[PDB]
Structure formats: C-alpha cells, structure tokens
Nucleic acid binder design. Structure first.
Ligand SMILES: [Zn+2]
Lengths: 149, 36, 143, 61, 129
RNA sequence: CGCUAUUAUUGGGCCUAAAGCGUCCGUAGCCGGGCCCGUAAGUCCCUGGCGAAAUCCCACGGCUCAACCGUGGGGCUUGCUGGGGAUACUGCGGGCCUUGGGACCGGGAGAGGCCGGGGGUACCCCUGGGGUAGGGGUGAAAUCCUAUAAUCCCAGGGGGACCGCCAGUGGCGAAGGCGCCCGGCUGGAACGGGUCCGACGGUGAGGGACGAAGGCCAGGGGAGCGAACCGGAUUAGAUACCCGGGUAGUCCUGGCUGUAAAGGAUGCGGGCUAGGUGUCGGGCGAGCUUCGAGCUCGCCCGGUGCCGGAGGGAAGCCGUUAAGCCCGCCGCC
RNA sequence: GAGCCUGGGCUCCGUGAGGGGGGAGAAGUCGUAACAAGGUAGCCGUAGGGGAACCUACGGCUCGAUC
C-alpha cells in the first residue's frame, strides 16, 4: 500500500504459469456458470463468489475452466452492477464516515481519512469516464451518494 | 522573517535573537512616525 | 536526484528554468538593467574634463603610513564633483586651482579603487593640455 | 535456480467426511468456513495462514 | 515507478560486470531487449542468452565473459541522419572504432556501421563499450 | 568575448562550506509496464521548385609575389514547400495480459483519533484534637510564618491540575505529536491469500487542509508553578545569577494567529551493487512443555537499530534504512 | 484637424524645519555578553523588561562537558 502511506508491503497471490486446466476438477463450465449465478442471487460480491468457489468447490481460475470472467458471465446474464463494486465500496465508506463526523466535529484525524477516500474515488471516476463504464459527466456528490447506497 | 542560519554563530557577532528584537522596534517606530 | 527536466518534450520548462536562475548572477543583471550607466558620473566615457576646486591629502590605510595627494574636480559634463589622485613625486606642485584637468580611471578590481588608497576612483592625466609625466620629469612647461 | 518463478505454498486436498462419507476437494489456506455439501458440518476452520483440518486427508494434489 | 526496462537491463549488466559475475537475470523482458542482446552477441560482448517463460512477461538469462567496460541507454532517443554519426561517436565512445552505437531504423535494429553501409539514419537507443 | 564546469543541453551543486518548502492532498503540464492489428502525424531515405549578390573554404589565372581582382567547385541563409517509399521507436485508434496500483475476506498487533463513565497517589485550604518554642532557607545570612499557638502528629470536609514504578536501544501516526482503567463510535498499515478490477500509475507550478510553545477575542475557572512587579542578601556597582512573595498565563468551551535547532540540519517513486548481529509484528517448520494467547532454534515477508568488506567522499564519515551506479518529476543556491 | 485653455493619469527630476538607520576612520569613554563547564552550558521561536553589550519565563535542539 503505497498510494498515500508509502509502505512497500508484499502480501499477494502466487498464481502458477498455467496454459491449461487440471484434470482433478470435478465441475464443468456450465455447472460453474450456474454456481456463479446462484451465489450472486444469494447476494455476494464477485470477490467473495470466487473465494467461495476456491474454498468450498475446489475451483481455481473460473477463467481457466470457463473462458470468461465472473463479471462477463453476469453481464451475459442480467446481474451486473450499474456502477462498479470497488467504487461502490468506497462511496459507502465515505457516507458512513460523514454521518460519524456530523456527530464528532473535533475528531480531526478521521477527516483526513475521508479526504483520502474521496481522492481515491475521484481517481477511479476519471478512469471509468475514459473507458466508458460511466458517462463522461458523472460526478461524485455525497448528498446523492446517500441515495446511491 | 527570512532568516539565515549563518547569523546564529556568535563569532564576530552579538546574538541574532536580540538583533531581531531591535529590528522590530526600529520598524514600529518608523511606522508610527510615518503616520500609521 | 536526477536533474530535471530531461524529457524529449520539456524544452519550454528548461528555457524557463535557465532564465529564472540567470538573474542570480550580478553581471547579467547589471548589464541588462544598465545600473553603471545610471550611477556613473562619466556617463560611460573613458575620460572626462574638469576644473580644480581644492587640493587635498588622504591617509593611507594601515599598516602603511603616508599622505596621498589628491584634488577635487568639478565635471563640465554634469557639474558633479569627484576626487582624483595625482601620481608622481611632486605632481601636486604642478597643479594650481581653477586649472582644467583630464580624468581617467585609476585601475582596480571591478573598475574601482586601487591599493592602499581608500575611496578614490580616478586619476589625473593632463593639466592645461600637457602630460603630467612630462611635467614631473621636467621636459615641458605648464601654460 | 532461485526464486525466479514464484510458486504457491498452498495446496488442494481431497478429504473424507466421516459421518456421511462424502469426498471433497478443498483449499488449504481458506478465508471462509468450509462445510460439507450434504451434512452441513464444518470440515476446515479458518485461521491466519493455514486452516485447521477437522476431517481426514486422503490425497494431496 | 518503472519507466524504462532497457536502461535497467544495461545498468544491471554494468554493475554485475564491475563485480565479476557470470550469469545475470533480467525480469521484465522485451523485444527491444532481445534485439539489443542479439547485436551484442554478434559483436562478441556477451555469451549465450536465453528466454524463459513465466506467466507474466518472460525473463532473460545472460552469460558474461568479461568484455564490457560500460553499457548504457541513450535518453532521450535522439534522431540522427546518415551524415551525422561522428558527433555522437565522439560524445559517447572513447576511440574512433571502439564500441557500438545501437540504432533503431525502419529496417530494424542495427549498429551505426551497418546503418552507414545502408545509408540510413534513425534513433539512438544504446551504447556499448 | 574567452579565462569561468562562477549559469552547467553537451556540463555544476543543496548532512556539516550558499542551498530540500514545517507536513500532506491534488489541477494544468512533464514522465510513463508487456503482446497483436491498423494508420502514417512526428522520425529516416530518394527525388522536383525556392532560400539575391557581397561576405566564408579550396584550386587555377592576372597585378614583381602578396594583400586585391577574375574564372570554377563547395558551403551559408538556423528553414519553407510539391511528390515517391519505409514502419523499428514515439503519437492516434481498436482488441488482449497481469507483474505495478486499487478493491475484498481472514485470524492477529498497536500510548492512531473522538465521546462517556469510574478511579489513584501526591499537593493547597478549612474545621475539630494533641503539644509548645521555634520553623523555613543558604556557601553564610536576612526578608517571611509563628505565643491571635506556628513547624510536627491524628480525625474529617472541600477543591484544581497530573496519571509515577512496570517503560525499552520499544510501539502507532503525514508531520506536529500520542502513556491510569472500562465501554461505545471511527481512521490507517503489515502478514496470509490459484479471491475481484485490469495500467486505473509517478511527480506536482498555481490552489487547498493540518500544523509545538507563546500571543489575541468572548465566556468560565484558578491548587501548584510563575514573565512583569515588590521586597532581602551578594556585589567596587547589581536594573542578574541565590532567597522570600506575587499579576497575566498555564486548564475548559468556541474562534483567530500560521510561526521553531518545525533537525535524520539528508525532497518523493522505481531497478541494481557482500553481509553479520540484535529487536517488534505476522506466517511456516522443528523440538521442549508446568499443556498456557507458554519456552527454545531456524526460514519468508515487512518495520526499527548497531557494526562493517568492496565502493564513495575535502575530510569528519556514509556504506542494500547510501552521502554508490542508472531511469524520472518538483523546489532551492 | 493644428494650436490655446481647462480638469485629469504615470514617470523622472530638484529642493525642505526636523527626525531615522547604515558604512568606513593611528587613537575618547562604560562595562566584559561570547570562544575552556569562558566563571549562571550555549543556541532557535514567542512575549515582557533594561544606560549598553544583555536578563527572565514557556516550549524545543545539541551545533554540550563531568561523574
Ligand atoms: Zn459430511
């Protein structure tokens, strides 16, 4: 996490260089997609869908087994989010923190956290505008985020 | 004030902090003699 | 860190950087603002004509001990008054008052003062259209 | 030669649930609780790092 | 952040030369790095480089033979005409035919000698001596 | 003009010599990971039309040679424009990738911040009881308190500030700075991770946010300490240092000021160039076990210290937590 | 549309009772603040005080010595 604090942590994943899927996998592509859809309807996020598929069903790399991604599957169907998940998570955090600071005016160390969150939001907004997943004039407004969430 | 850390070496010199106090006095007198 | 800016398309900022920091050299600043032309009583000339007002003597700086002979001069260009040195042994005996005199630079660091003489910037060359060197030797006669 | 191509220290495991007798492939470093798809019992409990297996390990892939 | 991998490759080679290594590993690979190494091998400055496939972007394993004094990237990549190679030779190299300027041309990557033979110019990207 | 690498593109410097904004967020601009397809704006080659003469270089010829003049060949005019071709690099456009970055989950660490409740000694005053001649302070004294009973001991009541030992070469935080216990609200980081997105990145002029002590405005409060001031001694003199008192202030609520040796006197990101020995957090592997959220050894990641070979430096010294070699951006001399 | 008159706006220049600082100068006086633990360790920031170098308070640095 280097964006603001400038600490050089390294705690990620080690994916092996695979060209093809393994044989010990019990499921097929159609069953995998059906599982994705069921776990979406239970109200899970993409990242948790994948974590559950890896921990409880033995599926590594939905994209290995199928040839698609989880969000592509959900868009092939009608279950994709209107705005992206990462942005939504950040907006929810900001809304909660703002209601906290309305009751705690002199905290003064969590307000900088709010500012950092909103700078992140703006970075992502600028990216998604260019790429087309948001309109070219979308703006972050807290008063309307209150309803977005 | 712009300050120069060289001035704080008290060789060939009186102490900088007291030079500063003097400067400020002369400034105020010049002001309340210019009219303000 | 690495010197900046170094990029292929950063020439505007390079030029601006150099223009900015070039004002920190006194030579460029004086040349471009014409400060010597503004404080110089000779008005940028190599020589000047003047009339003698008073003969005087100046004390040499320590650890030397001597009285350097000199003369006050009013400039016919602008009326300003300066002090000039009379070189030689006895040169001051050949200069009277109300005489006209030619003034040049004495020759020193940054076009200024020289040696143990304090605050004298100029030197006498001619008296009533005759050379001090020849007067001091004894060839010619003052008119 | 050295740590050139990073390779995973986690593994997948084929385990057996005693009561129901079901066979199941599961992950060694889980982040959710792992259950049997028949009983509903817990087979792996999540910790930091490696999970605590509460069943039988038949095979390691 | 990471801005230029060729510069890093060549600085790594220089430092490992200075302290006497035999094999060196270059983690983000590129086709420019491949072509520069090809030129260096043809001119005898290295030995037996190979490419390795990680899933990300390959690695290059290079063997050294104690022939490089200095190697470096040329930034910015100056454009140069066929009649203006000597200025840059004098600026980057110690003697008149000693080392190689590596030039990128529309016909490919080569040395300035080959480029002069063909009568073409291009862009400067590296020097080796 | 050169000397002057004392203006530095070629080609300089910023721990201690002049010089890193007090710290952070981010606008323009500058710099930007890997593969495939296209384009041909930058870039390169070839050819047509222009860039007056004089002035510059070379040879030959005419003045006794020469300077000069003439005949030819090149160059100069910092470049402009009509066409033909190439496609490595840069740019534009369209698809892919996961290593950089962001998101999410899990068991943990920590004086990070705010709110509320409950406490601990110590100090000052007051009221009762006892007892009676001094206490205090200094280098030595004196002011001062005291026979209207002090100093000292005991029982009580009320007050305001502060959180000892454990406590560290420790930890968290952007910095400033943060230590009694319990509960609630909240910010960030590390580790583990065949989880998600798929270059979303770096720096950052202008601009904004925070920012020790002290000082100002308004409202409260005031035990101890204590600028100013008032006394006593020392002293040649004492507008000081020592002693005895004491106003603002130091605390709370809400605002202003925007400063420090705000110092690692060392701007931020990335890659490479021997390590040894300690310590904090997480993980894994081995042994012990009083079976303990326990003890010991080793390894991986990330923080924080000491020493040190090559190397660097004017030297002091630095040395994988560079003051070394490379790729960038800002500020200053 | 000259030129004259009038009210305007910048700039440079020349003088002023009296006041204010700075720089040089064989050599006038008062003290001795700084360099040694310089005889009360020195220095930064803020505020108050004093013939003058200076003193005190709050917070900070070591560019500070001895056990
Ligand atoms: Zn079961």
């Amino acid at each position: 996490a280097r964006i603001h604090a400038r600490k050089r942590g390294k705690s990620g994943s080690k994916r092996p260089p695979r060209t093809a899927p393994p044989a010990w996998v019990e499921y097929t592509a159609e069953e995998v997609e059906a599982l994705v859809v069921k776990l979406r309807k239970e109200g899970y996020s993409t990242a948790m869908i994948g974590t559950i598929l890896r921990d409880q069903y033995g599926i590594p790399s939905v994209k290995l087994i199928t040839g698609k991604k989880i969000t592509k599957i959900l868009e092939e169907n009608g279950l994709a989010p209107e705005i992206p998940e990462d942005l939504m998570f950040l907006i929810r955090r900001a809304v909660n923190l703002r209601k906290h600071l309305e009751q705690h005016p002199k905290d003064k160390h969590s307000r900088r956290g709010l500012q950092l969150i909103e700078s992140k939001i703006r970075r992502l907004v600028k990216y998604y505008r260019r790429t087309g997943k948001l309109p070219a004039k979308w703006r972050y407004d807290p008063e309307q985020a209150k309803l977005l969430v | 004030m712009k300050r120069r850390p060289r001035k704080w070496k008290k060789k060939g010199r009186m102490r900088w902090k007291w030079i500063k106090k003097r400067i400020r006095r002369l400034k105020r007198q010049r002001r309340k003699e210019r009219g303000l | 860190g690495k010197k900046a800016p170094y990029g292929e398309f950063a020439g505007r900022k390079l030029k601006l950087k150099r223009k900015k920091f070039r004002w920190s050299d006194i030579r460029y600043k004086r040349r471009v603002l014409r400060l010597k032309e503004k404080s110089d009583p000779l008005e940028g000339a190599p020589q000047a004509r003047g009339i003698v007002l008073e003969k005087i003597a100046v004390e040499a700086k320590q650890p030397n001990s001597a009285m350097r002979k000199a003369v006050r001069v009013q400039l016919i260009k602008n009326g300003k008054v300066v002090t000039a040195f009379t070189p030689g042994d006895g040169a001051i005996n050949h200069i009277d008052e109300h005489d006209e005199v030619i003034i040049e630079g004495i020759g020193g660091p940054k076009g200024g003062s020289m040696g143990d003489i304090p605050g004298i910037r100029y030197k006498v060359v001619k008296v009533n259209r005759v050379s001090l060197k020849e007067l001091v030797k004894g060839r010619k006669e003052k008119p | 030669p050295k740590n050139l191509i990073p390779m995973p220290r986690s593994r997948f495991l084929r385990v057996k649930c005693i009561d129901c007798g079901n066979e199941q492939i599961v992950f060694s470093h889980p982040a959710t609780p792992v259950r049997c798809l028949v009983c509903g019992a817990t087979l792996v409990e999540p910790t930091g790092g490696k999970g605590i297996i509460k069943a039988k390990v038949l095979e390691v892939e | 952040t990471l801005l230029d991998p060729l510069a890093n490759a060549l600085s790594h080679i220089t430092n490992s030369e200075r302290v006497g290594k035999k094999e060196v590993y270059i983690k983000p690979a590129s086709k420019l790095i491949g072509e520069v190494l090809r030129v260096m091998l043809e001119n005898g400055y290295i030995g037996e480089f190979e490419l390795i496939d990680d899933g990300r972007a390959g690695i290059y394993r290079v063997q050294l033979i104690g022939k490089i004094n200095k190697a470096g990237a040329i930034k910015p990549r100056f454009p140069v005409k066929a009649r203006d190679y000597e200025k840059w030779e004098k600026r980057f190299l110690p003697a008149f035919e000693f080392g190689i300027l590596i030039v990128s041309t529309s016909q490919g990557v080569m040395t300035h000698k080959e480029a002069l033979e063909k009568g073409i110019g291009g862009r400067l990207i590296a020097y080796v001596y």
